[PDB]
Structures are given as C-alpha cells and as structure tokens.
C-alpha cells in the first residue's frame, strides 16, 4: 500500500521536513495528491532557484505542460483572470490565461524561455505588461488557506515554498512514463531515488500543517 | 544552408509529396516554418490515425504542449472562442481555450487521454459539451486560405491533411532537444531519419499550392 511504500522516505513529518530542506537547497521534490483524487506525482521546483537544467528535466520527463503556481495576490498583480469563467474541469484546476515573457524570449517554448517567463511573472515587482498573453507557461491560482482549504498540487506547491521560507511561487509538472501513461507511486519513488528528490503527499502536508499550528 | 541540408529529402515538390504520402499511411511528418520566423520544426500527425504511441512520442520528444489544429468551422462547432481577446503574442498564435474530453478520461494528461480528447474534439459530429474547459489539449484555429494566407505551422497542419485527402484536423508539437533548447534544422533532419519522418517547410507548401492551383 502507498503509505507502506513511502515508509522508506520516513514518517510523514520527516517526509515533509526533508522536502522543505531540499527546496531550501534549490533542489526539487515530488508531491503526490490523494489516491482517490488524481493519484499523480508532480515534480515541484521553487521559482527563485529555478534553472534551465531543472526546466529541461521537467520537459523531458513530465507532461511538458509546466504550470506556475502563484498566490492570488500575485495573479491579481499580473491581471491574470481565469482562463474560463465557468470552469467545468474535473478538479476545477485554476488555470489563468497562459503567458509568455514580453521581452527576453523568442518562441517561448525552450526550457530557457520558460524560465525567463516564469521568473518575469513571479517577480514581486512584476507588472501585467511584462507578460504577453497567450503563451507557453500556464499559471495556476492557489487557494487562500493552501492545502488546508484545497488538497491540490497547486496549493501544495505554494504551501511548500512558504513553509520553506521561500518566495511563494513554484512550478509543477506531472511525472509521465516513457510510454505516456502517468507515473504511479512505484515509478514516482523510483524516479525520486534516481534524481535525489524527496517524495511526500498532500496528506503529509495537511497533517504537518495541522500538527504545528502553521498558518501561512 | 537550410535548402541544401534538405536536398537529401528531395526537391520541394517531392518533399511535399512524400509528406502527404506519409500522412496517408498514418505516419508523422516534420514541418519547418520560415527561418526568419520561428525556425522551428513541429512533429505533425493526422488526427484520424492518431495513436497513443504517436502521442507518447510527441510528449517525450517535443515541448509537451500538444496542439490540435482545427478549421474555423470545427472550432466554431465546438464553441471554442480564442483564449484571449487581444492576442499580443508574437506570432498571434490562435490558441482557443484549452479542452479536455468530458467522458472517457481521468486527469487528461496521459497520452491516451490526450488522444481521447483530440478525437472527441475533432469528430465532425462533435458538440460543445463533449469537451470540458479548461484542459490539457490546446486547440488552434487555422486561418482560411491556409499557408497561402498565414505561413504558420497551424495552417501547414490543416493544409497537409486536406491536400492528403484526410479529415482536416492534425496535431503538432515542437521538437525539443534533450537539454531543452529547440531543435534546429540539423537535429530535425537527424530526428526525421531516426523515426522515418519526411521533412518539409512551409515554403515548400506555399510553392506547391501555388504551382498546382490548389484551393482547399
Ligand atoms: O492539471 C494539472 C496541471 O495542468 C495537474 O493536475 C496539477 O497538479 C493540477 O493542479 P491541482 O492538483 O491543484 O488540481
Ligand atoms: O506556439 C506553438 C504551439 O503552442 C507552435 O509555435 C506552433 O507551431 C504555433 O503555431 P504557428 O506556427 O501557426 O504560429
Ligand atoms: Mn511572488
Ligand atoms: Mn495534480
Ligand atoms: Mn473535423
Ligand atoms: Mn510554430
């Protein structure tokens, strides 16, 4: 069972602490949501240490649809409305209109261009016009309350950054197997081993926030 | 120079004929746009023969942001408005709001789910509600006139399908190098060799349409 499979990463508190420490060191982590939800593992990286090589890894190993998780304040600062008014997607994933950096990029898709666009959007001094729309980076609005309000990877990502003392912005992308099927827990653990990436779950995060009166 | 590099695929007419023949056989092709434009090569597949293995190849070898090129009529039939009203992206790429199949899929990202969503959207009997919005497939509206009106991969894709006698819908995604840089003409030719994919250019297509009074 999943809990058993993740015992080798530690108990849930340790799984969380190790994930926060990796983010502080500028490395990436792997977050699983609930098995009854998507049952998917996302590579997560902090924006402030994001490199081209980290972006290249997400693109060649994940779905390629790399999302920027932002606070509501930061999405508002950028004037990013939701992509659609009545979002009838399954999880109601909070996609804004997509974005490209307006300067410093060419077609927008190269790993470097995506990082340039991500760092431009996430800049606390960003202004709306720094971003052309549409583009090849996909922002997601994290709910206030984080994973204590919505058990999504979006909220997990921004919560991880805050809990780690980092700028509240991170990127994510779903781990995909070579044959196009989505990575399940055994493949996610194995990929974390290869790439020295801690593995944790939203459930670990909820327990942790609800054991250390953590309001972010 | 590029023209020289592509002489080994034939003269421009032959490059086009070989691309149309591969599509009819259900294989994929590689389309380059103008060197002064994006200078990028897209893997293109026809929707009607699209398989999970073909979708898995685009995801692990390309940007992962897989687009469905549709006619204006078909995008209208699906009630797909442009993602943004004032599109200030560089090429004014005609992104609609993104889509997922409403039935037959789980999270939407697996290669199989994307094909399910693509085949649902492209179905000539499709209705708007067959697609949830937003999602993980990105439709693009091809301009009337095709590449004789707009020299984009979008129009190249739908034009290729029509010229080949196929249903006017195809998918595309930009060929990406392992390190995240975008594939340039030498890498595109080499990738076409490996995967037995013809290579052609929008310029080949414009010449061809303007040498065989081809109005589609
Ligand atoms: O759809 C996705 C991004 O395109 C992934 O499923 C991402 O994890 C969605 O976020 P969430 O888990 O918060 O709904
Ligand atoms: O942006 C893209 C898809 O996301 C690619 O550049 C695609 O080729 C864009 O289409 P076009 O060449 O017609 O502008
Ligand atoms: Mn910020
Ligand atoms: Mn998710
Ligand atoms: Mn059609
Ligand atoms: Mn293009």
XYZ file of N, CA and C in Angstrom, chain A residues 14-197:
552
model
N 8.744 13.639 8.736
C 10.074 13.634 8.132
C 9.989 13.835 6.629
N 9.035 13.164 5.982
C 8.821 13.380 4.556
C 8.610 14.855 4.250
N 7.913 15.569 5.126
C 7.692 16.987 4.887
C 8.977 17.768 5.141
N 9.618 17.526 6.289
C 10.844 18.251 6.615
C 11.892 18.061 5.530
N 12.050 16.828 5.032
C 13.059 16.590 4.002
C 12.714 17.316 2.708
N 11.416 17.450 2.399
C 11.015 18.163 1.185
C 11.314 19.650 1.315
N 11.011 20.230 2.478
C 11.301 21.643 2.692
C 12.799 21.914 2.597
N 13.616 21.045 3.201
C 15.065 21.202 3.140
C 15.579 21.110 1.699
N 15.054 20.183 0.901
C 15.531 20.133 -0.475
C 15.203 21.437 -1.205
N 13.989 21.985 -1.000
C 13.638 23.244 -1.668
C 14.589 24.364 -1.260
N 14.958 24.412 0.026
C 15.859 25.454 0.503
C 17.221 25.321 -0.153
N 17.633 24.103 -0.440
C 18.876 23.869 -1.147
C 18.725 24.075 -2.644
N 17.546 24.471 -3.117
C 17.360 24.679 -4.538
C 17.128 23.428 -5.356
N 16.824 22.295 -4.722
C 16.501 21.057 -5.421
C 14.985 20.896 -5.514
N 14.557 19.903 -6.292
C 13.151 19.626 -6.492
C 12.635 18.468 -5.661
N 11.314 18.408 -5.533
C 10.622 17.385 -4.759
C 9.522 16.807 -5.627
N 8.899 15.735 -5.135
C 7.804 15.049 -5.826
C 6.633 14.953 -4.865
N 5.522 15.572 -5.225
C 4.316 15.625 -4.423
C 3.232 14.776 -5.073
N 2.709 13.844 -4.299
C 1.548 13.047 -4.654
C 0.318 13.653 -4.004
N -0.788 13.672 -4.737
C -2.048 14.039 -4.127
C -2.731 12.758 -3.662
N -3.963 12.884 -3.201
C -4.682 11.753 -2.636
C -4.892 10.671 -3.679
N -4.820 9.412 -3.228
C -5.004 8.300 -4.147
C -6.388 8.319 -4.778
N -7.403 8.782 -4.045
C -8.768 8.858 -4.565
C -8.981 10.087 -5.439
N -7.981 10.964 -5.564
C -8.106 12.166 -6.371
C -7.465 11.936 -7.742
N -6.352 12.611 -8.026
C -5.639 12.340 -9.269
C -4.697 11.146 -9.143
N -4.135 10.912 -7.948
C -3.165 9.823 -7.748
C -1.967 10.018 -8.682
N -1.483 11.250 -8.724
C -0.416 11.626 -9.637
C 0.677 12.286 -8.830
N 1.907 12.160 -9.329
C 3.057 12.793 -8.727
C 3.536 13.921 -9.628
N 3.713 15.089 -9.035
C 4.215 16.258 -9.744
C 5.644 16.531 -9.285
N 6.552 16.735 -10.232
C 7.797 17.427 -9.914
C 7.487 18.871 -9.546
N 8.027 19.330 -8.413
C 7.878 20.702 -7.937
C 9.258 21.339 -7.769
N 9.427 22.577 -8.261
C 10.633 23.368 -8.022
C 10.262 24.773 -7.542
N 11.057 25.345 -6.652
C 10.914 26.750 -6.307
C 11.349 27.657 -7.452
N 10.603 28.741 -7.649
C 10.923 29.640 -8.747
C 12.264 30.315 -8.507
N 12.576 30.669 -7.259
C 13.718 31.555 -7.081
C 15.047 30.863 -7.371
N 15.098 29.531 -7.342
C 16.310 28.819 -7.705
C 16.180 28.124 -9.047
N 15.123 28.417 -9.797
C 14.821 27.637 -10.989
C 15.899 27.851 -12.030
N 16.393 26.750 -12.602
C 17.383 26.800 -13.671
C 16.845 26.184 -14.958
N 17.564 26.468 -16.048
C 17.260 25.859 -17.341
C 17.367 24.347 -17.279
N 18.390 23.823 -16.580
C 18.527 22.370 -16.491
C 17.346 21.766 -15.741
N 16.872 22.434 -14.680
C 15.676 21.931 -13.983
C 14.450 21.964 -14.893
N 14.295 23.046 -15.653
C 13.200 23.114 -16.608
C 13.344 22.065 -17.714
N 14.579 21.793 -18.169
C 14.757 20.764 -19.197
C 14.337 19.405 -18.661
N 14.596 19.149 -17.379
C 14.238 17.853 -16.791
C 12.722 17.663 -16.753
N 11.988 18.676 -16.270
C 10.530 18.605 -16.303
C 10.014 18.354 -17.703
N 10.608 18.996 -18.708
C 10.030 18.860 -20.041
C 10.270 17.458 -20.589
N 11.467 16.889 -20.392
C 11.728 15.580 -20.994
C 11.164 14.413 -20.182
N 10.853 14.635 -18.897
C 10.350 13.584 -18.015
C 8.881 13.739 -17.630
N 8.293 14.912 -17.803
C 6.929 15.153 -17.360
C 6.022 15.432 -18.559
N 4.783 15.862 -18.276
C 3.796 16.050 -19.322
C 4.221 17.143 -20.281
N 5.156 17.983 -19.879
C 5.541 19.120 -20.696
C 4.665 20.342 -20.498
N 3.533 20.204 -19.822
C 2.613 21.323 -19.625
C 2.965 21.859 -18.248
N 3.960 22.754 -18.207
C 4.587 23.196 -16.960
C 3.815 24.389 -16.427
N 3.363 24.299 -15.179
C 2.490 25.308 -14.592
C 3.254 26.080 -13.539
N 2.949 27.377 -13.457
C 3.452 28.284 -12.430
C 2.391 28.504 -11.351
N 2.629 27.996 -10.153
C 1.696 28.195 -9.052
C 2.007 29.525 -8.371
N 1.007 30.399 -8.347
C 1.101 31.730 -7.774
C 0.038 31.928 -6.699
N 0.333 32.810 -5.747
C -0.702 33.296 -4.847
C -1.757 34.085 -5.634
N -2.927 34.242 -5.012
C -3.972 35.088 -5.587
C -3.494 36.521 -5.713
N -2.724 36.989 -4.744
C -2.255 38.366 -4.827
C -1.401 38.557 -6.070
N -0.468 37.621 -6.304
C 0.454 37.765 -7.424
C -0.278 37.605 -8.761
N -1.231 36.669 -8.857
C -2.013 36.570 -10.089
C -2.810 37.855 -10.324
N -3.376 38.428 -9.255
C -4.060 39.721 -9.375
C -3.085 40.803 -9.836
N -1.893 40.862 -9.228
C -0.932 41.891 -9.633
C -0.637 41.823 -11.130
N -0.629 40.617 -11.693
C -0.384 40.431 -13.115
C -1.643 40.576 -13.963
N -2.792 40.823 -13.351
C -4.044 40.929 -14.100
C -4.274 39.650 -14.891
N -4.159 38.513 -14.190
C -4.382 37.218 -14.831
C -5.767 36.728 -14.421
N -6.791 36.911 -15.245
C -8.077 36.325 -14.963
C -8.054 34.832 -15.245
N -9.040 34.096 -14.739
C -9.099 32.668 -15.047
C -9.216 32.490 -16.548
N -8.671 31.391 -17.034
C -8.800 31.115 -18.454
C -10.263 31.067 -18.868
N -11.122 30.424 -18.062
C -12.542 30.309 -18.388
C -13.389 30.745 -17.206
N -14.567 31.295 -17.507
C -15.415 31.834 -16.445
C -16.068 30.704 -15.650
N -16.786 29.814 -16.328
C -17.372 28.641 -15.680
C -16.476 27.437 -15.978
N -15.578 27.155 -15.040
C -14.597 26.080 -15.137
C -15.290 24.762 -14.809
N -15.605 23.968 -15.837
C -16.221 22.661 -15.631
C -15.211 21.515 -15.768
N -13.918 21.800 -15.593
C -12.918 20.741 -15.478
C -13.116 19.965 -14.167
N -12.594 18.735 -14.145
C -12.899 17.789 -13.068
C -12.501 18.338 -11.700
N -11.227 18.691 -11.529
C -10.742 19.249 -10.275
C -10.901 20.761 -10.215
N -11.436 21.396 -11.264
C -11.577 22.848 -11.250
C -10.187 23.477 -11.058
N -9.198 22.881 -11.725
C -7.838 23.413 -11.726
C -7.854 24.867 -12.183
N -7.207 25.751 -11.410
C -7.425 27.204 -11.531
C -6.486 27.858 -12.548
N -6.557 27.348 -13.783
C -5.777 27.863 -14.902
C -6.147 29.313 -15.179
N -5.138 30.185 -15.179
C -5.308 31.500 -15.782
C -5.045 31.396 -17.278
N -5.281 32.499 -17.977
C -4.821 32.626 -19.346
C -3.307 32.388 -19.350
N -2.796 31.776 -20.417
C -1.377 31.457 -20.449
C -0.571 32.702 -20.764
N 0.735 32.617 -20.504
C 1.612 33.783 -20.543
C 2.937 33.466 -21.230
N 3.491 34.490 -21.878
C 4.890 34.497 -22.286
C 5.514 35.768 -21.739
N 6.799 35.713 -21.393
C 7.577 36.937 -21.243
C 7.471 37.777 -22.512
N 7.271 39.080 -22.315
C 7.186 40.029 -23.418
C 8.552 40.406 -23.971
N 9.613 40.313 -23.158
C 10.983 40.554 -23.595
C 11.893 39.444 -23.089
N 12.939 39.162 -23.857
C 13.971 38.219 -23.416
C 13.793 36.785 -23.860
N 12.875 36.529 -24.785
C 12.484 35.198 -25.225
C 12.266 35.259 -26.729
N 12.172 34.088 -27.355
C 11.929 34.024 -28.779
C 10.548 33.346 -28.968
N 10.501 32.033 -29.142
C 9.210 31.388 -29.376
C 8.499 31.044 -28.079
N 9.217 31.035 -26.963
C 8.629 30.853 -25.670
C 8.725 29.444 -25.134
N 9.029 28.452 -25.986
C 8.927 27.067 -25.560
C 10.234 26.514 -25.011
N 11.387 26.993 -25.478
C 12.658 26.459 -24.995
C 12.658 26.446 -23.473
N 13.364 25.491 -22.878
C 13.463 25.493 -21.424
C 13.858 26.865 -20.877
N 14.775 27.566 -21.557
C 15.271 28.848 -21.056
C 14.191 29.919 -21.122
N 13.488 29.991 -22.249
C 12.390 30.930 -22.384
C 11.356 30.705 -21.295
N 11.062 29.439 -20.960
C 10.018 29.187 -19.961
C 10.463 29.703 -18.604
N 11.732 29.486 -18.275
C 12.266 30.012 -17.025
C 12.230 31.545 -17.030
N 12.621 32.165 -18.148
C 12.563 33.617 -18.274
C 11.141 34.118 -18.030
N 10.152 33.485 -18.667
C 8.751 33.848 -18.447
C 8.322 33.584 -17.007
N 8.732 32.454 -16.444
C 8.347 32.142 -15.077
C 8.944 33.161 -14.104
N 10.243 33.470 -14.258
C 10.872 34.443 -13.370
C 10.288 35.842 -13.572
N 9.915 36.202 -14.797
C 9.284 37.501 -15.029
C 7.936 37.595 -14.317
N 7.099 36.570 -14.477
C 5.783 36.572 -13.857
C 5.877 36.600 -12.337
N 6.830 35.845 -11.776
C 6.900 35.631 -10.337
C 7.571 36.785 -9.597
N 8.266 37.656 -10.311
C 8.931 38.827 -9.757
C 7.940 39.633 -8.918
N 8.205 39.829 -7.622
C 7.231 40.570 -6.802
C 6.940 41.960 -7.339
N 7.840 42.547 -8.138
C 7.604 43.832 -8.791
C 7.019 43.689 -10.189
N 6.537 42.504 -10.549
C 6.009 42.319 -11.889
C 4.841 43.278 -12.129
N 4.692 43.714 -13.387
C 3.505 44.402 -13.873
C 2.861 43.629 -15.028
N 1.551 43.801 -15.232
C 0.849 42.969 -16.235
C 1.509 42.945 -17.601
N 1.991 44.088 -18.043
C 2.508 44.180 -19.394
C 3.861 43.522 -19.555
N 4.481 43.077 -18.474
C 5.699 42.289 -18.606
C 5.437 40.950 -19.269
N 4.164 40.547 -19.381
C 3.745 39.254 -19.913
C 2.814 39.453 -21.096
N 3.180 38.883 -22.245
C 2.237 38.741 -23.337
C 1.297 37.577 -23.025
N 0.097 37.604 -23.614
C -0.879 36.532 -23.457
C -1.463 36.307 -24.847
N -1.680 35.046 -25.268
C -1.356 33.778 -24.591
C 0.124 33.433 -24.735
N 0.543 32.325 -24.133
C 1.911 31.876 -24.187
C 2.044 30.398 -23.804
N 3.246 30.014 -23.348
C 3.584 28.602 -23.170
C 3.933 28.249 -21.724
N 3.607 29.146 -20.787
C 3.609 28.879 -19.355
C 2.190 29.080 -18.852
N 1.761 28.202 -17.955
C 0.361 28.116 -17.546
C 0.252 28.398 -16.061
N -0.161 29.607 -15.670
C -0.288 29.914 -14.244
C -1.541 29.307 -13.647
N -1.421 28.983 -12.368
C -2.494 28.430 -11.566
C -2.594 29.234 -10.277
N -3.819 29.589 -9.919
C -4.114 30.374 -8.726
C -4.284 29.420 -7.552
N -3.411 29.536 -6.563
C -3.545 28.754 -5.341
C -4.575 29.379 -4.410
N -5.441 28.534 -3.855
C -6.460 28.999 -2.924
C -5.855 29.476 -1.607
N -6.406 30.567 -1.086
C -6.095 31.009 0.264
C -6.429 29.897 1.257
N -5.535 29.694 2.205
C -5.546 28.511 3.043
C -4.665 27.368 2.563
N -4.290 27.340 1.289
C -3.405 26.273 0.846
C -4.077 24.914 0.931
N -3.316 23.904 1.374
C -3.824 22.542 1.325
C -4.849 22.305 2.432
N -4.884 23.160 3.457
C -5.969 23.116 4.436
C -7.310 23.601 3.876
N -7.318 24.224 2.704
C -8.528 24.682 2.038
C -8.828 23.906 0.770
N -7.796 23.473 0.043
C -7.946 22.714 -1.198
C -6.752 21.789 -1.329
N -7.003 20.482 -1.396
C -5.947 19.477 -1.406
C -5.412 19.253 -2.828
N -4.979 20.342 -3.447
C -4.412 20.253 -4.788
C -2.898 20.419 -4.830
N -2.255 19.939 -5.909
C -0.825 20.153 -6.068
C -0.524 21.637 -6.130
N -1.452 22.423 -6.691
C -1.281 23.878 -6.775
C -1.019 24.452 -5.389
N -1.934 24.176 -4.462
C -1.792 24.644 -3.085
C -0.605 23.982 -2.382
N -0.352 22.696 -2.643
C 0.847 22.062 -2.099
C 2.109 22.817 -2.476
N 2.206 23.212 -3.741
C 3.390 23.897 -4.237
C 3.625 25.223 -3.531
N 2.613 26.075 -3.461
C 2.807 27.372 -2.817
C 3.014 27.209 -1.317
N 2.314 26.249 -0.699
C 2.498 25.972 0.726
C 3.925 25.514 1.020
N 4.452 24.590 0.208
C 5.840 24.151 0.367
C 6.791 25.349 0.377
N 6.630 26.268 -0.580
C 7.507 27.432 -0.658
C 7.427 28.283 0.605
N 6.214 28.669 1.003
C 6.044 29.412 2.247
C 6.657 28.670 3.434
N 6.278 27.400 3.624
C 6.786 26.651 4.769
C 8.309 26.613 4.775
N 8.924 26.656 3.596
C 10.373 26.609 3.466
C 11.004 27.977 3.576
N 10.206 29.026 3.784
C 10.752 30.367 3.859
C 11.180 30.958 2.531
N 10.642 30.447 1.438
C 10.970 30.895 0.094
C 9.889 31.839 -0.447
N 10.237 32.578 -1.494
C 9.251 33.335 -2.251
C 8.077 32.430 -2.636
N 6.795 32.875 -2.421
C 5.638 31.959 -2.580
C 5.281 31.664 -4.037
N 6.214 31.064 -4.767
C 5.927 30.691 -6.145
C 6.777 29.493 -6.519
N 6.135 28.521 -7.161
C 6.793 27.286 -7.537
C 6.206 26.822 -8.847
N 6.889 25.871 -9.485
C 6.434 25.302 -10.743
C 6.153 23.823 -10.512
N 5.317 23.250 -11.372
C 4.983 21.842 -11.248
C 4.768 21.247 -12.628
N 4.872 19.927 -12.697
C 4.517 19.205 -13.910
C 4.427 17.724 -13.590
N 3.497 17.036 -14.246
C 3.153 15.673 -13.868
C 4.163 14.669 -14.422
N 4.656 13.803 -13.543
C 5.619 12.805 -13.954
C 4.935 11.792 -14.875
N 5.505 11.613 -16.074
C 4.980 10.756 -17.131
C 5.965 9.637 -17.446
N 5.438 8.422 -17.628
C 6.276 7.289 -18.020
C 6.633 7.392 -19.499
N 7.698 6.727 -19.927
C 8.066 6.809 -21.345
C 6.931 6.500 -22.300
N 6.067 5.547 -21.958
C 5.006 5.135 -22.870
C 3.776 6.056 -22.823
N 3.811 7.136 -22.020
C 2.776 8.134 -21.998
C 1.768 7.977 -20.877
N 1.706 6.802 -20.265
C 0.937 6.637 -19.039
C 1.536 7.496 -17.928
N 0.714 7.842 -16.959
C 1.155 8.714 -15.881
C 1.836 7.872 -14.823
N 2.890 8.427 -14.228
C 3.661 7.688 -13.235
C 2.823 7.458 -11.986
N 2.791 6.211 -11.538
C 2.141 5.850 -10.288
C 3.192 5.709 -9.201
N 2.719 5.508 -7.974
C 3.594 5.615 -6.811
C 4.873 4.802 -6.941
N 4.872 3.562 -7.438
C 6.166 2.857 -7.562
C 7.157 3.567 -8.471
N 6.697 4.053 -9.636
C 7.566 4.756 -10.571
C 8.015 6.102 -10.008
N 7.151 6.759 -9.240
C 7.489 8.040 -8.619
C 8.576 7.870 -7.569
N 8.453 6.857 -6.704
C 9.515 6.592 -5.729
C 10.834 6.313 -6.450
N 10.789 5.452 -7.477
C 11.995 5.087 -8.220
C 12.617 6.307 -8.885
N 11.785 7.206 -9.441
C 12.311 8.433 -10.055
C 12.911 9.383 -9.016
N 12.272 9.503 -7.860
C 12.855 10.290 -6.781
C 14.214 9.768 -6.339
N 14.362 8.434 -6.247
C 15.666 7.831 -5.951
C 16.721 8.258 -6.977
N 16.455 8.011 -8.259
C 17.402 8.389 -9.297
C 17.850 9.833 -9.176
N 16.903 10.743 -9.012
C 17.176 12.172 -9.107
C 17.308 12.819 -7.744
N 17.376 12.014 -6.681
C 17.664 12.534 -5.346
C 16.620 13.576 -4.955
N 15.356 13.219 -5.176
C 14.221 14.097 -4.937
C 13.371 13.483 -3.842
